[PDB]
Amino acid sequence: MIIANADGCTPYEVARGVTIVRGEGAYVYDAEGRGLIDLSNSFGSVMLGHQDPVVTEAVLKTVRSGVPAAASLDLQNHLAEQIAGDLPGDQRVAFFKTGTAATRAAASAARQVTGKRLIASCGYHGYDLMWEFTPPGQPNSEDVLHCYHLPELIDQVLDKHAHELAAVIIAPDYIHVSPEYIADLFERCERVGVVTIADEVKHGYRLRQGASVTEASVVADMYTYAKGISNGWPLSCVAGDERFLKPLAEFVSTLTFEAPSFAAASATLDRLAELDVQAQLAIDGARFVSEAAKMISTRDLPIEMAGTGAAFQFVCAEEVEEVLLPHALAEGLILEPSDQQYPSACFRGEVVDDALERLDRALTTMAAARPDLVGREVTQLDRVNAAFCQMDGLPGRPDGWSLDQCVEYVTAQL
Amino acid sequence: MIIANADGCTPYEVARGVTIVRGEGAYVYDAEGRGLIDLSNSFGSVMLGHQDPVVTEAVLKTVRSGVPAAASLDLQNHLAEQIAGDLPGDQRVAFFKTGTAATRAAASAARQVTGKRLIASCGYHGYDLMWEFTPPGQPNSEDVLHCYHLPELIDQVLDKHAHELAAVIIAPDYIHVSPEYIADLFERCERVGVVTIADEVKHGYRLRQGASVTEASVVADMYTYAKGISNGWPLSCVAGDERFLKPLAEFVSTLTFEAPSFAAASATLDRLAELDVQAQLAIDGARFVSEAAKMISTRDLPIEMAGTGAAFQFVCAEEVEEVLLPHALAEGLILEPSDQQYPSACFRGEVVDDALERLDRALTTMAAARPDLVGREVTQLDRVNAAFCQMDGLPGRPDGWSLDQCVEYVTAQL
Ligand SMILES: CN[C@@H]1[C@@H](O)[C@@H](O[C@@H]2[C@@H](O)[C@H](O[C@H]3O[C@H]([C@@H](C)O)[C@@H](O)[C@H](O)[C@H]3N)[C@@H](N)C[C@H]2N)OC[C@]1(C)O
Ligand SMILES: CN[C@@H]1[C@@H](O)[C@@H](O[C@@H]2[C@@H](O)[C@H](O[C@H]3O[C@H]([C@@H](C)O)[C@@H](O)[C@H](O)[C@H]3N)[C@@H](N)C[C@H]2N)OC[C@]1(C)O
Ligand SMILES: Cc1ncc(COP(=O)(O)O)c(CN)c1O
Ligand SMILES: Cc1ncc(COP(=O)(O)O)c(CN)c1O
Ligand SMILES: [Cl-]
Ligand SMILES: [Cl-]
Ligand SMILES: [Cl-]
């Protein structure tokens, strides 16, 4: 086709054989009027639900005013205050339009302050070539080294380059590793004096009202947000200590301060607080995951639930996931492949029961269509592969694997 | 304040002492209800006028549908077809959210295809550190060399690095240099086989329905657009030959394909065609500039008009511009400093006469407030300084200047 970039982080791939035309709350609707429970939510950018009435009213009033970009100083500063006030310490906030822009800007700030170039990384930070994964110990074309969330690989990069690193940037994750495991990655870098960036683009405002790493007893020099803050409107930020944010003074685009996205984001943060969204998702998602695990068990299918609350995953072999996903779609349940699911604030009350009923039907048709899968075992390699897709790293060194085997595994995935 | 990035390319700086609350058509309105003719138009991102009724209806319908990101395949492909169809050749289109993202992506594509790193540049391509200006012959921190629109500096970089360059990226401009001058910059690079990027972020869809360089008898391997295509909504693109666009397949963000901006952009391109916008601006802007020059002449003030149509500039010393701009604001006319003005499609009919009447009053109060300025001469250095701010380069080597003097001048501006 003529659109060159319809690949990568594009959501709703399971539904490419149907046509989605409307979204409302927890549901999206196809061209035939069928409602589907949406667990993609634009890859987690929709934290409140589609067409949230308060976000929509704020955007509509802003559009109808016609106020041009960079004129709504009170609103822009207010959103910055909202974001900074949820982080421990004294932060300034620089706004961008995508998560990739925010993470590259955070890295650029660290390079400007330290005068160093090399960056070490765990996780996916966006589409820019600076974030392209290369094997352990091999700097990519923009001088970024990738450590795959392993403390031993962080230790190697620190042993060889601690004096040379502008920063370490870590995307936290908690489905397959603990908060203590994530905190240890940050602390190893802090102890040698390396600037830290907590890449909260995925989890910021999803797991709690602020940065996920705060609850892991971590503080970072800079934090990046995008998905959680704006309910599907294109806004992101770097929030961090003044020393690192001052070099971003001129990091501005013509439409950095277009008003509709600021209105959406400020309303989103207020609504997340008002509806107690992250705490309620912890409860409702836990119920979904526990009941899903029970249904899988009674049907003897080779799937395991991992995680809970706002971030959980159907762990299974690729061959099994390729059956699960179409069977769920046929029952009106949209799941993202090779990733966590992304429930929104609308995944509460009867919506959870509706989703469970649809999953129950999908598991029944799956077992009837593919009886050869009933009784199949989930292997260690299934679990490792599922973790590597979800968190873009290894969930610690798997039991029985040497560090060399970990490096060979990761290299083979690229 | 807590917003770290309120500097740089932020529009409406002349109005930082007043509060703008509404925009409609050619006008914005302050908190006291006063209407001001807007010649910033969000630094030229508003090509149709604030709250264009057709763009607004398309956006509102899209917001009210709640359709999530990446679901409106027909609309996304349609916009790509609209853009590619206005360029000679067979293009594919990769979408981004800001002009800076598009120009960095175009440069990255050239690096991927050629396997080379060094880039040569004329003009401003955005806020990323890769676009930070350094003196002639000094590569910046991301291996970009800056040539300041001078053919002799392009020749030096080609003499030293032609075999090494991934691409040359040129932002065209036509206020202070001719289309033939711009074409020569591209042709010098073509002849030695270097990939060319026409950075049309400012002029694409402003001067004609497509790339400005097309009318200068230029073709480029890639083109970047942003300001002209979306009437203030955050959307940009790289449009170019398949060989260069294929490496951008995975250059995607979660909200690359959020629907409101695509609806705005597709409606904007249709409206620009329907209202014959660029041709009509050529006429109305020419009338404004000619009459403005006449009024300046009768009042004997040290200002010269440069350019015409959709892109013109009040050329004067910084000391004079600092009087002109507040005096124009006091008469309800918003001008951008140290740049061209950016009239929109609403700058037609009686709006042009209204703007001329306001300018006439501002010139009268200026002459009465600052009688010492009456009869002052505009110097060569005034003209060169004005060109350097507007086009981020030299308008050819000024008369009587050596190439060394040009290099020293540019170095002193950084
Ligand atoms: C197979 N090589 C992959 C490479 O393709 C790429 O994978 C990304 C992956 O990281 C992204 O996925 C990542 O980002 C998404 C978010 C963007 O929606 C998160 O939801 C998800 O948890 C995270 N794994 C996915 N969206 C696209 C793949 N091409 O980056 C990591 C990698 C291992 O190098
Ligand atoms: C004084 N050093 C400057 C440096 O500050 C910067 O200048 C930019 C300038 O290029 C931009 O201006 C540029 O981009 C704007 C567009 C973005 O609105 C265009 O309208 C304008 O014609 C163009 N000159 C201006 N918006 C911000 C300055 N800091 O980039 C060029 C430079 C010469 O290195
Ligand atoms: C953790 C993380 N960091 C950064 C990014 C990049 O953000 P974006 O897709 O908005 O460019 C992503 C991908 N969305 C992400 O999940
Ligand atoms: C010619 C040119 N190129 C690229 C850019 C960068 O675009 P943006 O401000 O949208 O990031 C600009 C500045 N807007 C520009 O004028
Ligand atoms: Cl709902
Ligand atoms: Cl009007
Ligand atoms: Cl961006």
- Sequential DSSP letters for B224-263: EE-GGGSTTSS-EEEEEEHHHHGGGTT---TTTT-HHHHH
CB contact under 8 A, A42 and B80: no
| A–B CB contacts, 8 A cutoff, strictly below | 280
DSSP B301: -
Two structure tokens written together for B223: 């083109």
- Check: CB of residue B255 under 8 Å from CB of residue B97: yes
Query: Ligand 2 pocket: which of B5, B7, B9 to mutate (most atoms <8 Å of CB)?
Result: B9
Secondary structure class of B21 (helix, strand, coil): strand
- Asked if the structure places residue A10 within a domain, the reply is no
Distance, first Cα to last Cα, chain B = 26
Two structure tokens written together for B49: 């006028």
CB contact under 8 A, A20 and B80: no
Residues in chain B: 414
Q: Comparing C-alpha atoms, which of A118, A132, A208 is closest to residue A172? A: A208
Core vs surface per residue B356-386: b (16+ CB within 10 A) or e = bebbbbbbeebbeebeebeebebeeebbbbb
- Asked if the structure places residue A296 within a domain, the reply is yes
Do both A250 and A127 map to the same domain?
yes
Nearest ligand, measured from the Cα of A254: 4
Distance, first Cα to last Cα, chain A = 26
Q: Which residue among B217, B246, B274 closes a domain?
A: B274
- Asked if the structure places residue B111 within a domain, the reply is yes
HEC readout, B264-313: HHHHHHHHHHHCCHHHHHHHHHHHHHHHHHHHHHHHCCCCEEEEECCEEE
Domain CATH for B107: 3.40.640.10
CA atoms of A248 and A105, how far apart (whole Å): 7
Q: What is the CA radius of gyration of chain A?
A: 21
Q: Comparing C-alpha atoms, which of B91, B201, B189, B85 is closest to residue B147? A: B189
- Asked if the structure places residue A215 within a domain, the reply is yes
For residue B341, what are the β-bridge partners?
A: B312
Chain B residue with Cα closest to A19: B71
Do both A84 and A160 map to the same domain?
yes
Q: Given A4, A41, A101, which is nearest B248 (Cβ)? A: A4
Beta-strand ranges (E) seen in A99-245 are: 118-122, 144-146, 165-170, 196-199, 222-225, 236-241
CA atoms of B102 and B120, how far apart (whole Å): 17
DSSP assignments along B165-191, one per residue: EEEEEE----SSS-HHHHHHHHHHHHH
Q: Give the closest residue (by CA) to ligand 1 atom 17.
A: A9
Q: Comparing C-alpha atoms, which of B366, B356, B215, B345 is closest to residue B299? A: B366
CB contact under 8 A, B3 and A92: yes
Tell me the technique behind this structure.
X-ray
Do both A86 and A112 map to the same domain?
yes
Q: Which residue among B251, B274, B297 closes a domain?
A: B274
Question: How many domains is chain A partitioned into structurally?
Answer: 2
- Asked if the structure places residue A228 within a domain, the reply is yes
Q: Is A217 in the pocket of ligand 1 (CB under 6 A)?
A: no
- Check: CB of residue A334 under 8 Å from CB of residue A269: no
Asked whether the CA dihedral B240, B245, B248, B252 is positive or negative, the reply is: positive
Do both A318 and A358 map to the same domain?
yes
Q: Given B69, B84, B108, which is nearest A129 (Cβ)? A: B108
Query: Ligand 2 pocket: which of B39, B124, B177, B224 to mutate (most atoms <8 Å of CB)?
Result: B124
Do both A29 and A66 map to the same domain?
no
CB contact under 8 A, B4 and A238: yes
Do both A88 and A223 map to the same domain?
yes
Q: Comparing C-alpha atoms, which of A35, A23, A7 is closest to residue A329? A: A35
For residue B165, what are the β-bridge partners?
A: B118
CA atoms of B75 and B66, how far apart (whole Å): 15
- Asked if the structure places residue B399 within a domain, the reply is no
Do both A32 and A107 map to the same domain?
no
DSSP B8: S
Two structure tokens written together for B108: 């990255």
Do both B259 and B173 map to the same domain?
yes
Q: Chain-centre distance of CA A49, in angstroms?
A: 16
Domain CATH for B336: 3.90.1150.10
Do both A261 and A340 map to the same domain?
no
CA atoms of B247 and B249, how far apart (whole Å): 6
Residue at A31: amino acid letter: A
- Asked if the structure places residue A383 within a domain, the reply is no
Residues in chain A: 414
What helix, strand, coil percent values describe chain A, rounded to 5?
45, 15, 40
CA atoms of B226 and A347, how far apart (whole Å): 37
CA atoms of A310 and A279, how far apart (whole Å): 9
Tell me which chain A residues have a C-beta less than 8 angstroms from the C-beta of B51. 63-66
Do both B185 and B249 map to the same domain?
yes
From B189's Cα to the closest Cα of chain A, the distance in A is 25
Do both B62 and B104 map to the same domain?
yes
Per the structure, the complete domain to which residue A248 belongs is given by 54-274
Q: Which residue among A258, A274, A290 closes a domain?
A: A274
Chain B residue with Cα closest to A24: B66
CB contact under 8 A, A127 and B70: no
CA atoms of B294 and B286, how far apart (whole Å): 12
Q: Comparing C-alpha atoms, which of A40, A133, A138 is closest to residue A392? A: A133
- Asked if the structure places residue A117 within a domain, the reply is yes
Q: Comparing C-alpha atoms, which of A386, A409, A406 is closest to residue A396? A: A406
In degrees, rounded to 5, the angle at the alpha carbon of residue B228 between the alpha carbons of residues B223 and B229 is 80
Q: In what order do the strands lie in the sheet with A333-334?
A: A20-24, A27-30, A35-38, A333-334
Do both A293 and A158 map to the same domain?
no
CA atoms of B245 and B367, how far apart (whole Å): 54
Core vs surface per residue A8-34: b (16+ CB within 10 A) or e = ebbbbebbeebebbbbbbbbbbbeeee
Cα-to-centroid distance, B252 and ligand 3 (Å)? 9
CA atoms of A46 and A379, how far apart (whole Å): 33
HSE-up of residue A333 (Cα within 13 Å, Cβ side): 24
CA atoms of B361 and B378, how far apart (whole Å): 21
